[PDB]
Symmetry: T
Subunit: 143 residues, 12 copies
């Protein structure tokens, strides 16, 4: 059985109950539930985790590197800013799928650049919360 780490970065704990015009009306706990529901359908286990702490994100990335498990990562603002987080992600031997809820190319110019994309397997942007469900489906087929 494949175990998949879903990791949300800064501010995404406020999903759904804040800024529904931007990031959608699904809350972080509902997101967790949808991911676990889809994982069961696919015969996988999803571990869904969110933190505002870069140190804490790096630790979760490290652990998935040690376990050789895949990661679906929405790093929030750290996508555009963190070399630390890119270098922890570059270490992963299993696939890394980068997810943005919003279309980061329809926004400010600075969101169009990701430290993560070049070292990710692939990227999904602007498809809302389905982004994560779709990433999980890719990883279920690419084992």
């Amino acid at each position: 059985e494949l175990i998949v780490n879903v990791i949300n970065g800064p501010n995404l704990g406020r999903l759904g109950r804040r800024e529904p015009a931007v990031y959608g009306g699904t809350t972080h706990d509902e997101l967790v539930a949808l991911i676990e529901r889809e994982a069961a359908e696919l015969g996988l286990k999803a571990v869904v985790r969110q933190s505002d702490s870069e140190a804490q994100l790096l630790d979760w990335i490290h652990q998935a590197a040690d376990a050789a498990e895949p990661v679906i990562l929405n790093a929030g603002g750290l996508t555009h800013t963190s070399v630390a987080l890119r270098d922890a992600c570059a270490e992963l031997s299993a696939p890394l799928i980068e997810v943005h809820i919003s279309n980061v190319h329809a926004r400010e110019e600075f969101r169009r650049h990701s430290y993560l994309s070049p070292i990710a397997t692939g990227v999904i942007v602007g498809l809302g919360i389905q982004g994560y469900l779709l990433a999980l489906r890719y990883l279920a087929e690419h084992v």
Copy 2:
């Protein structure tokens, strides 16, 4: 019933039987078949079309604009170069999902820029041919 236009741009007719290291071993005719198989599973119809001609691509974009049908577009090198094709795509009232087979951010700097992303609903890159199957699944849920 939703009808979805899958549109491939220049060079992608050579899929699978050329450059399998880059764009994967699935051929364009197999791609068509996989998309039509998945469409049936989802209760949709996919019209899958490829052209090396920008004029011909624009016509297919126009027709989907007139029908208000969604489009999954992998525009190939025109992604990075064509304002004409962006302005035809900007006209679409149904969702437009941009797909790249390869991760265009792990390549030359010029592939990191898309004329299409800012006017697309969303973007999927680097997930190979599954990219298209995943886009089709989003569009099946977002009706």
Copy 3:
């Protein structure tokens, strides 16, 4: 008698019946009619032609170069992208007036740059469809 070639590039066949907020409510066939009406008033003949095909546009540019006739060209997205079309236009010995319906300077930064302006006699932007009628009036006085 002066003969004037009016040449519309990609997407402008959809004028008026699409995107009236941007490019105005005059359709391409009405545009043709207004140009031919104004040409008669001025004692000229206008040949009004539109194509989504760069190859086809180049051929029409070539023919006007061979006839030494003037051209009013709205190249659409190719304004910002095509060196091919600029080099065919650079060949014209009679005047070349560049026309944009929309004000391309009140839009995305990329529309502010034209390959054509430097080799054109002159440029008219943002005055809608009158742009073309005004270009025709200049060419009637500059013979």
Copy 4:
């Protein structure tokens, strides 16, 4: 009856009797006369004014803003340099047509950028003095 303010910026008082290779052989007083002749033909009144003083130009822009009258403005070198003059022009509620006698895109790179274009209704460049007559004709139709 429409009243139209034609406003010339620095150095354009020297028109025609200087630099005829660049800006044409029509003098500023002849320019005035041609504009007033064309205005009568169109059933409008043109007030044609030139100043080397940015303060004086701003005052003339202010007055047209207060009267809600249109403006045809050739700001000369201030086109490329003045945010003050752009912000006075941005205030106009009637149309603002930017005019350059010369084709500013066939010259030094710095002339290709205008502070005024983004806030103008439209722009006419390189059509010489007819530029102004054509702008007046647009404003006569867009009332």
Copy 5:
């Protein structure tokens, strides 16, 4: 009664007892006292908090977003670097005043750019510690 959150970012706990040539001789505890003294004079309550932890700053921003209370934020080096902190601040519905003690425009070029200014109500720089007292006075009048 208005409650105002004053939030200091990395390194500003060392105020006054370090680098008095740059950031002034007022210490962080004296800063707190001056802010609370001025708040009483104005009939408001100030909650003054400092942290070297971006995670901790984000939490304090979140809480003010939930309470709809205003914030005076001096984010220190994170002003120039953090998209995470900008996106938490963008969420605030009450006013956000950005404060720098030093004039960040008289220093290295990189300090001249703030992620925060575009989403702030306003900015006060280079007026030392009075910066904060002045921000508090604005917020007292803008309720």
Copy 6:
């Protein structure tokens, strides 16, 4: 007794009775009155002056340099354009506070750059007309 020169640059004579959405509903004469009212409260004298003329602004800057009096300067569009005005301001030996009514960082990219900030004591932006009252309060304490 401290005397403070408040100097407004181009277009700001139109305050309040124009563009109230941008620069607020306070007129220039009301601005004067509010500044003189606050000056009395603070035991200072404010000399409040506005001009559309760069030459006239430079003269007022010169006079304050000769008197060694402080200046609150909102230079309008000249903030982003004038080296002349910066070099006159650099001469001031008493404090210079730069004021913008609007938040110039939430607007076009060109307004984010000031010739004045690097040579000013400090800057206040986006706090509307209170900007000036707050600058006056700083200068009252920094004597």
Copy 7:
């Protein structure tokens, strides 16, 4: 026997009978003849083809990729603009020699950049029509 594809892009059908000051007085049909004459001397066969159509150029590139035959390509304005054409050329397993008639470095800055050079075996510029004869001689020795 080596077969070599000589491929000319947009506008080069007008060679010699147009713009002899820039591209020389040899016409496209004479070019063909000179290339076939030189090929016989070298014991090779040259297939010389020109098109204004990017789609048509891509097809000719595809065919040479399938045959593993070399290509001498002068892509005209598409040299500086087309990623599509670069990606078809990148596929060639036999040598690709890029040819410009004119010295593209003695012209506008934009002609100094080629999408093709990085994926070509080599480049020959500014040696006029001999460019092609020289490329053919290289390919005759590098088999």
Copy 8:
């Protein structure tokens, strides 16, 4: 007899009695005297004039253009900012020598760029007030 116009731009009326560390201890009236003393020695007449007004500078440039007399111009901050003043100077048929008192290349990056240098005969910078005496000596030999 040669007549030479020496023209000083904004802020240079304050020479010598202000900022002697930067621009030297010679006052504007002493500068005038030194220039007239040197002119007599050389058998020329110098007309030495200073203005803070761009309009006034343009008028003095115009007059020298009409008289075909040479100009020594220190435009102050307008050197780096004014296209208006460059275009009036470009009109001069006699030599134009650009003078800076200070070495503008040992200062802020923005002072290293002059609108005037490209259209001047020559430039003298950083040699203080002798700059002007040396320019006058060149013009005495180049008649």
Copy 9:
């Protein structure tokens, strides 16, 4: 006796047992041991510490600033990203030696820029783990 703080930033806890091709086969605990062995040889004491937390790094920098002790800092990805960490380091009165294990100039363009180098005493890059031993030897001689 000199006390030297050796401080490792994000991801460097994984040294040696991960990515030995990049950062070498020495683990973080072996690194500690080698540094303490060399310190004894030199008559110094090394305090060797690693953290993934920017807040924690800043605290360790603060403490060395308060003790006026030197620091050898390998900040990992924060080298290229953190102004916070630069400003804490700028405070150090004893020497600061920046160390990179890898040669950061033989890698991606973004690693070639350090916030730390300009405020460091000196920099050592690409000499692997010896980097640290060499920095310690410099600090032993520069007391």
Copy 10:
């Protein structure tokens, strides 16, 4: 009889016996021999010279300028760096062919820029040592 100067710049004395993967297995003495063999076939004389000294290269360029003889120049790293060498080459009245052995466009970005190309007759890159033989053949026909 035409005399042709073949001039090799820094490091190219090491040809063939060093870095055969990059610059090919032909040594500098073999290069000389091949060039002299081809010159005899063509009825010309080649003078083949190499130097690591820019001063020495300039002297050889000077001599060919004085003799009005053509030059084939591979300047090595000086191609991308030397304005001195460009200005000596600009003086040549006979043709100058720039040669690179390697394709300088398939390498680091800095090799893509040549000081020499704009003033050369033409350029040949990436065709190895044949580059020189081909340049000699052009010069034999262009006399």
Copy 11:
């Protein structure tokens, strides 16, 4: 008695007998003579030297640094390229006057940048050979 070193860099040995349209018809030996004639008039001694060798130029700069004598330096193409030569010049304790014969601002963009200007006392450009005579006159007064 003041001794002044006049130092000419690469290519300037060819003065006057080459490129008289650019650098004037005075030869290097005549230049020497004019400088020595003017030096006698001024009561100074000029040592006039030219070299194509950067090493040789550096030695002459070194010697003037050791003697604390002034230098008039026209470095030719090395002006725009050499940090070595700038750092030798930065060492001079007596004045350094940079001279260009041609106006380097009316030419290619790359000539507008000098490594030398920022460390020179002053710069004289475009005044031909008089440049040197004028520099000598400054140095005679500034002792």
Copy 12:
């Protein structure tokens, strides 16, 4: 026994007896002595050489490439300017350590870029003359 080439570029012959504030009070002959003293301690031989001549530096680089011996290179201003010297250094099969005495990142922006760093084993900057002693110690351990 390891032989190590220590190579100093332009201006560094003047070490210690010039510019002691920048490059330290150790002279070039003392530098030699310290390096030879340290080499004996380490059981190596150092050959220490300095030249102002790029040609001479290239020859010394060539010889070390032929001997497969390591090099410690401080190239002076050529660090930032010379592609020739980089390409000779790229040839070295033994380690190349780049040394700067000064911290080149605390200086002008242009010194922050090295042609050498990307092809060096490693870099040591700002540690003064110890830089060289430390490089020698690395090379003694990395054999």
